[PDB]
Enzyme design. Structure first.
Site, PDB file in Angstrom:
ATOM      1  NE  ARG A 137      46.335  35.233  37.614  1.00 21.28           N
ATOM      2  CZ  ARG A 137      47.666  35.022  37.889  1.00 21.28           C
ATOM      3  NH1 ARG A 137      48.374  35.430  36.870  1.00 21.28           N
ATOM      4  NH2 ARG A 137      48.151  34.366  38.925  1.00 21.28           N
ATOM      5  CG  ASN A 138      44.007  37.672  40.546  1.00 25.63           C
ATOM      6  OD1 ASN A 138      42.864  37.719  39.872  1.00 25.63           O
ATOM      7  ND2 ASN A 138      44.727  36.766  40.998  1.00 25.63           N
ATOM      8  CG  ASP A 151      39.426  38.073  42.521  1.00 27.54           C
ATOM      9  OD1 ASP A 151      38.100  38.416  42.775  1.00 27.54           O
ATOM     10  OD2 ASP A 151      39.343  37.302  41.389  1.00 27.54           O
TER      11      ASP A 151
HETATM   12  C1  LIG Z   1      39.507  41.063  31.013  1.00 31.02           C
HETATM   13  C2  LIG Z   1      37.926  41.827  31.012  1.00 31.02           C
HETATM   14  C3  LIG Z   1      37.874  42.382  32.528  1.00 31.02           C
HETATM   15  O1  LIG Z   1      38.389  43.527  32.648  1.00 31.02           O
HETATM   16  N1  LIG Z   1      37.500  41.601  33.624  1.00 31.02           N
HETATM   17  C4  LIG Z   1      37.037  40.149  33.290  1.00 31.02           C
HETATM   18  C5  LIG Z   1      35.426  40.132  33.525  1.00 31.02           C
HETATM   19  C6  LIG Z   1      35.003  40.718  34.992  1.00 31.02           C
HETATM   20  C7  LIG Z   1      35.644  42.173  35.118  1.00 31.02           C
HETATM   21  N2  LIG Z   1      35.625  42.655  36.484  1.00 31.02           N
HETATM   22  N3  LIG Z   1      35.618  41.725  37.494  1.00 31.02           N
HETATM   23  C8  LIG Z   1      35.480  42.341  38.843  1.00 31.02           C
HETATM   24  C9  LIG Z   1      35.375  41.785  40.066  1.00 31.02           C
HETATM   25  C10 LIG Z   1      34.247  41.832  40.631  1.00 31.02           C
HETATM   26  C11 LIG Z   1      34.054  41.311  41.883  1.00 31.02           C
HETATM   27  C12 LIG Z   1      35.267  40.768  42.451  1.00 31.02           C
HETATM   28  O2  LIG Z   1      34.924  40.027  43.667  1.00 31.02           O
HETATM   29  C13 LIG Z   1      35.990  40.347  44.616  1.00 31.02           C
HETATM   30  C14 LIG Z   1      36.228  39.274  45.552  1.00 31.02           C
HETATM   31  C15 LIG Z   1      37.235  39.456  46.737  1.00 31.02           C
HETATM   32  C16 LIG Z   1      37.877  40.655  46.967  1.00 31.02           C
HETATM   33  C17 LIG Z   1      37.493  41.707  45.945  1.00 31.02           C
HETATM   34  C18 LIG Z   1      36.708  41.480  44.722  1.00 31.02           C
HETATM   35  C19 LIG Z   1      36.218  40.667  41.854  1.00 31.02           C
HETATM   36  C20 LIG Z   1      36.425  41.293  40.457  1.00 31.02           C
HETATM   37  C21 LIG Z   1      34.968  43.756  38.171  1.00 31.02           C
HETATM   38  C22 LIG Z   1      34.660  44.999  38.758  1.00 31.02           C
HETATM   39  N4  LIG Z   1      34.703  45.147  40.299  1.00 31.02           N
HETATM   40  N5  LIG Z   1      34.670  46.152  38.105  1.00 31.02           N
HETATM   41  C23 LIG Z   1      34.672  46.055  36.705  1.00 31.02           C
HETATM   42  N6  LIG Z   1      35.013  44.981  35.942  1.00 31.02           N
HETATM   43  C24 LIG Z   1      35.140  43.963  36.759  1.00 31.02           C
HETATM   44  C25 LIG Z   1      37.330  42.087  34.879  1.00 31.02           C
END
Ligand SMILES: C=CC(=O)N1CCC[C@@H](n2nc(-c3ccc(Oc4ccccc4)cc3)c3c(N)ncnc32)C1
Length: 271
Positions: A137-138, A151
């Protein structure tokens, strides 16, 4: 420019294009930075994060750079909610991606996903940076099908107590080794255990680990020395790799460098 530190992005440079849904810690959008660079914008809901501590940590996270690690470009902290600006990963969360049966994955694709994550984790281990909540999920997937770790370390700044202690209702019990569940002993070896559970999630096409058990039952199972068993798509050699992550003795678990060598060996043998 003036008023902005090297870790600070001016939110006026953002163009919002698409709502991506609610991820862990808040609403996420797809947009552009300065009209042409693709970014994801993660909006942190007020009261959910230890903001000053996260901002200080974002300065260290900016300096982490690896092709299999989601890049943090900067933060926007002059307003509320604060924004986290990162690399855009068009195919979204790995867990959802694995659950889409249309992909009809080959096991070589599954092993490549494991290798991508292992390379990112070997890099974090080389920087003495713990993920602290590694799971499918991360992880995110880009337009080229490359999986990257996301994350990383963020759980340290979550204020909701249900997520932060083993005794909490939203704690990642199913990805935790016995010493975390029993004593809260986090280390490189608790990220190794979690990586083995992630390999199991990948080879299981996104099944929940210990799918018929509660978290309470899972903790009892693990503490009794019992483990997950082999996903149908995992060869004996792949199963041996994930299982090695689950040794009862943390110091008998491999490092990410060793795991990488094991994965490359299986990739060569199963090519
Ligand atoms: C189940 C649906 C699905 O796919 N999901 C759920 C809805 C949002 C979708 N998602 N999320 C990110 C993302 C953006 C920023 C981030 O911050 C960090 C903080 C600390 C360290 C690294 C990153 C973390 C994740 C994200 C992304 N970058 N690109 C596209 N989709 C994203 C994924």
């Amino acid at each position: 420019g003036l008023g902005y530190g090297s870790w600070e992005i001016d939110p006026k440079d953002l163009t919002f294009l698409k709502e991506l849904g609610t991820g862990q810690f808040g609403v996420v959008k797809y947009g552009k930075w300065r009209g042409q660079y693709d970014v994801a914008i993660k909006m942190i809901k007020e009261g959910s994060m230890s903001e000053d501590e996260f901002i200080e940590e974002a300065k260290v996270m900016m300096n982490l750079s690896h092709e299999k690690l989601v890049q943090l470009y900067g933060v926007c902290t002059k307003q509320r909610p604060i924004f986290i600006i990162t690399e855009y990963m068009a195919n979204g969360c790995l867990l959802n991606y694995l659950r889409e049966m249309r992909h009809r994955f080959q096991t070589q694709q599954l092993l490549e996903m494991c290798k991508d994550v292992c390379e990112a984790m070997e890099y974090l281990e080389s920087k003495q940076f713990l993920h602290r909540d590694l799971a499918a999920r991360n992880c995110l997937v880009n337009d080229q099908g490359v999986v990257k770790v996301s994350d990383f370390g963020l759980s340290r700044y979550v204020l909701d107590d249900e997520y932060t202690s083993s005794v909490g209702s939203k704690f990642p019990v199913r990805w935790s080794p016995p010493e975390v569940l029993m004593y809260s002993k986090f280390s490189s070896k608790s990220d190794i255990w979690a990586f083995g559970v992630l390999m199991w999630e990948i080879y299981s096409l996104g099944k929940m680990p210990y799918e018929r058990f509660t978290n309470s039952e899972t903790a009892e199972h693990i503490a009794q020395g019992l483990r997950l068993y082999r996903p149908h798509l995992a060869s004996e050699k792949v199963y041996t790799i994930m299982y090695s992550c689950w040794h009862e003795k943390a110091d008998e678990r491999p490092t990410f460098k060793i795991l990488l060598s094991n994965i490359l060996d299986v990739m060569d043998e199963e090519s």
